[PDB]
Design a protein around this motif. Structure first.
Motif, PDB file in Angstrom:
ATOM      1  N   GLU B  13      58.589  86.020  36.539  1.00 31.48           N
ATOM      2  CA  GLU B  13      59.487  84.914  36.214  1.00 31.48           C
ATOM      3  C   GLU B  13      60.958  85.291  36.393  1.00 31.48           C
ATOM      4  N   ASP B  14      61.760  84.303  36.792  1.00 33.99           N
ATOM      5  CA  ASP B  14      63.200  84.491  36.973  1.00 33.99           C
ATOM      6  C   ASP B  14      63.524  85.549  38.024  1.00 33.99           C
ATOM      7  N   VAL B  15      63.146  85.289  39.271  1.00 37.31           N
ATOM      8  CA  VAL B  15      63.431  86.230  40.349  1.00 37.31           C
ATOM      9  C   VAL B  15      64.420  85.618  41.340  1.00 37.31           C
ATOM     10  N   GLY B  16      65.586  86.244  41.481  1.00 36.18           N
ATOM     11  CA  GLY B  16      66.603  85.755  42.409  1.00 36.18           C
ATOM     12  C   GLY B  16      67.126  84.382  41.990  1.00 36.18           C
ATOM     13  N   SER B  17      67.089  84.098  40.692  1.00 35.19           N
ATOM     14  CA  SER B  17      67.549  82.803  40.192  1.00 35.19           C
ATOM     15  C   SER B  17      68.934  82.913  39.558  1.00 35.19           C
TER      16      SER B  17
END
Lengths: 31, 31, 31, 31, 31, 31
Positions: B13-17
């Motif tokens: 979760e939350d990758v490159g965001s």
């Protein structure tokens, strides 16, 4: 043999993410 | 043999965001 | 043989993330 | 003669950009 | 004669950028 | 004659950038 159990868990969070502030440059003003 | 169980879990979760603020440049004003 | 159990856990968090502030440069003003 | 000829230049490039590789997780093979 | 001819230059590059590799975790093989 | 001819230069590069490799953890093989 009689009893065999296997549990695998992979967890990843917050990779390469930006929750703060990134700015190239800022200027109050020019006179 | 008699009993065999396997459980595999993959979670990311939350990758490159970006949840924050990204800005190239900002200027108060020019006079 | 009679009893066999295996548990594997992989966990990673906050890698290469920015929660603070990154800025190239800032100027109060020019007169 | 009072004041003239003003030149201002602002330049910003490559801010918060990704040219490399970002991966949450990598796994070869399981069992 | 009072005051003239002003040149201002602002330059910012490569801020908070990723050109390399960011990985949460790497695993070859399991059992 | 009073005061003129001013040149200001601001330069910033490679701030908080990642050109290498960042890994949370690396594992070859398990059992």
């Amino acid at each position: 043999y009689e009893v065999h159990h296997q549990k695998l868990v992979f967890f990843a969070e917050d990779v390469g993410s930006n929750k703060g502030a990134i700015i190239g440059l800022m200027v109050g003003g020019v006179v």
